């Protein structure tokens, strides 16, 4: 439950919260109203959790993308500044916080990821992703690495994934098609494939997270990192001589970071809505208010026209804006939340080798355990496909095995005719099917199918497919019966 004569604010711990607290101190001096600034972990998830019982902060700071979901659920107060105030901020920043015709937050700043590079290691940073492996080998021989960035959050890997064609939700005449997701298409696969072979080639580590990449760059251990304007303060402190530049191209195309508008929403259960509007409108969104936050941790390109114009000469801000121009604004639709957890899981699963990129992105796109046909009929001379597939909770072992057995009709015993094991198909030269079996399976899609060519009358019998995918060293089986005809 929310008290009542004061303001509690949540903001991410990577942003200028001490600078925000100082604006809080000034508000408190003028008004006598206490302003507490907190930075809870995963506050983007904590907010809806507690705001559903009417709990949480009076005001929450996050990128605009999460606010559609908050608004849909009725967690945010409608924002109603007059036209005079609105005119103080860029119109596009207001569009980012409009949901279902209503303004539901105040925009603060435009963030995009950039390439950051150590000028003493790399006076001339690569223009291209494809250069990076060769660069890394050079730098490795000198006890350094080429690149480290946060691999745990899809925000950071998305620019590469989207570069050659990936998208979240298709944008089509004024609206997002929630049914048309582009995390599976050929472009997205190429981008994530490039990323996982950086890892498989030891140019990056699948475990690398935000703290590890920041520490490595700031200690001069790696030549480049990918991060937003909040990060620049920490590198200034370290003294590393850095530049901030355009992200490398991939297959000749710009990297495409998702652009965020840092925004401040007012809790619908806040008894302090007029005080919150006063703070944000009269204290935060002023040159001095934004300056105080910005000098703590850089904001990016601020929403407030006067101060954006003041800051716009900074070439690090120019680079941020150039990267944003090449990327695209995040949708603010409530589905964004599902999108992010889907791609997060796909990246981690692909980066660790639990899935191939195809498998991984299929699942993201979407977010009797053995199957054979019952009975197949063939003509003499024809070929028949003997489908076999399975479903499992396990990743695909490789060590995965498939075995086909055959039992002639009226016959006694089932004999092996085909075996897939340790990555290779073996036929059997014993076979009455020798030179007539064809492997058409693919263990990566949990498929063990074969084709029998040039059917004969005496091929009549029952085939059994047996699959082991080790965890899972217990054989699951299914049977298919073949009848061969002159015709029918
Ligand atoms: O990684 C998925 C995550 O990415 C975007 O979050 C950013 C946020 O915009 C930045 O301000 C910065 O703090 O880093 C975050 C990524 O770690 C989305 O805003 C967020 O909803 C999403 O879950």
UniProtKB/Swiss-Prot annotation:
Disulfide bonds join 388-465. Belongs to the myelin P0 protein family. It is linked to Charcot-Marie-Tooth disease, demyelinating, type 1B: A dominant demyelinating form of Charcot-Marie-Tooth disease, a disorder of the peripheral nervous system, characterized by progressive weakness and atrophy, initially of the peroneal muscles and later of the distal muscles of the arms. Charcot-Marie-Tooth disease is classified in two main groups on the basis of electrophysiologic properties and histopathology: primary peripheral demyelinating neuropathies (designated CMT1 when they are dominantly inherited) and primary peripheral axonal neuropathies (CMT2). Glycans are attached at residue 460. Residues 368-481 form the Ig-like V-type domain. Homodimer and homotetramer. It is found in: Cell membrane. Changing residue 413 to V: In CMT2J and CMT2I. N-glycosylated; contains sulfate-substituted glycan. It comes from the Eukaryota. Is an adhesion molecule necessary for normal myelination in the peripheral nervous system. It mediates adhesion between adjacent myelin wraps and ultimately drives myelin compaction. Changing residue 473 to L: In CMT1B and DSS. Residues 368-488 are extracellular. Found only in peripheral nervous system Schwann cells. Changing residue 396 to F: In CMT1B; moderate. The chain holds residues 30 to 150 of 248 of the full protein. This is Myelin protein P0. Changing residue 416 to L: In CMT1B; severe. Changing residue 382 to F: In CMT2I and CMT1B.
């Amino acid at each position: 439950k929310i008290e009542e004569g004061k303001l509690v604010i949540w903001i991410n711990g990577d942003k200028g919260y001490n600078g925000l607290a100082e604006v809080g101190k000034k508000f408190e001096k003028d008004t006598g109203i206490k302003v507490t600034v907190e930075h809870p972990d995963k506050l983007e998830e904590k907010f809806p959790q507690v705001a559903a019982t009417g709990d949480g902060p009076d005001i929450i700071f996050w990128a605009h993308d999460r606010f559609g979901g908050y608004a849909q659920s009725g967690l945010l107060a409608e924002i109603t500044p007059d036209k005079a105030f609105q005119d103080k901020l860029y119109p596009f920043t207001w569009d980012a916080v409009r949901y279902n015709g209503k303004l539901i937050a105040y925009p603060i700043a435009v963030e995009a990821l950039s390439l950051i590079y150590n000028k003493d290691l790399l006076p001339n940073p690569p223009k291209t992703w494809e250069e990076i492996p060769a660069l890394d080998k050079e730098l490795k021989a000198k006890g350094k690495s080429a690149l480290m960035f946060n691999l745990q959050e899809p925000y950071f890997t998305w620019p590469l994934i989207a570069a050659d064609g990936g998208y979240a939700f298709k944008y089509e005449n004024g609206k997002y098609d929630i049914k048309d997701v582009g995390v599976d298409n050929a472009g997205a696969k190429a981008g994530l494939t490039f990323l996982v072979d950086l890892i498989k080639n030891k140019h990056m580590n699948a475990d690398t997270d935000y703290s590890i990449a920041e520490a490595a760059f700031n200690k001069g251990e790696t030549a480049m990192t990918i991060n937003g304007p909040w990060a620049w303060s920490n590198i200034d402190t370290s003294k590393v001589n850095y530049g901030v530049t355009v992200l490398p191209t991939f297959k000749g195309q710009p990297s495409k970071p998702f652009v965020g508008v840092l925004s401040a929403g007012i809790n619908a259960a806040s008894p302090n809505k007029e005080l919150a509007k006063e703070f944000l409108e009269n204290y935060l969104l002023t040159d001095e208010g934004l300056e105080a936050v910005n000098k703590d941790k850089p904001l990016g390109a601020v929403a407030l026209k006067s101060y954006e114009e003041e800051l716009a000469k900074d070439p690090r801000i120019a680079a941020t804006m150039e990267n944003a121009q090449k990327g695209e604004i995040m949708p603010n639709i409530p589905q964004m939340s599902a999108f992010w957890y889907a791609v997060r899981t796909a990246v981690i699963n692909a980066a660790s080798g639990r899935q191939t990129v195809d498998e991984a992105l299929k699942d993201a796109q979407t977010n009797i355990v053995v199957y054979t046909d019952r009975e197949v009929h063939g003509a003499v001379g024809s070929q028949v496909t003997l489908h076999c597939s399975f479903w499992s909770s396990e990743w695909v072992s490789d060590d995965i095995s498939f075995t086909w057995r055959y039992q002639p009709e009226g016959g006694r015993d089932a004999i092996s005719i085909f075996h897939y094991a340790k990555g290779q198909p073996y036929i059997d030269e014993v076979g009455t099917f020798k030179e007539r079996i064809q492997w058409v399976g693919d263990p990566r899609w949990k498929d063990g199918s074969i084709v029998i060519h040039n059917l004969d009358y005496s091929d009549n019998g029952t085939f059994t497919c047996d699959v082991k995918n080790p965890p899972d060293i217990v054989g699951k089986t299914s049977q298919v019966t073949l009848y061969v005809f002159e015709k029918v």
